[PDB]
Nucleic acid binder design. Structure first.
Ligand SMILES: [K+]
Ligand SMILES: [Zn+2]
Ligand SMILES: [Zn+2]
Ligand SMILES: [Zn+2]
Length: 86
DNA sequence: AGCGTGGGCGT
DNA sequence: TACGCCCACGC
């Protein structure tokens, strides 16, 4: 089911999509292709660079349906919304 | 809370 | 392959 395997001796993880294996390899090579223009920190993934930049800009696109409180990431809002339960 | 970052996936 | 979502986990 998951043909693409990690060729690293220490690792044993396997994947179903080659591009996921290609991504995974960066853990071992330590490559971080995506750099924040603001603080020069490097990141392994472009999507994580995007949410990181919001720490600098204060951009918060995700608002709680119940109280309107805003968050930088969707999963932050998700974690928050549940507090309005009983 | 604030956020790094891998997992799985659709496109 | 890249891009960028949700999703989850970790501190
Ligand atoms: K291996
Ligand atoms: Zn590996
Ligand atoms: Zn930065
Ligand atoms: Zn709320």
């Amino acid at each position: 089911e998951r043909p693409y395997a990690c060729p690293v001796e220490s690792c044993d993880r396997r994947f179903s999509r080659s591009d996921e294996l290609t991504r995974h390899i960066r853990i071992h090579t330590g490559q971080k292709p995506f750099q924040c223009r603001i603080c020069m920190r490097n990141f392994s993934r472009s999507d994580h660079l995007t949410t990181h930049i919001r720490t600098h800009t204060g951009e918060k696109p995700f608002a709680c349906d119940i109280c309107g409180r805003k968050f930088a990431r969707s999963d932050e809002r998700k974690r928050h919304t549940k507090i309005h339960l009983r």
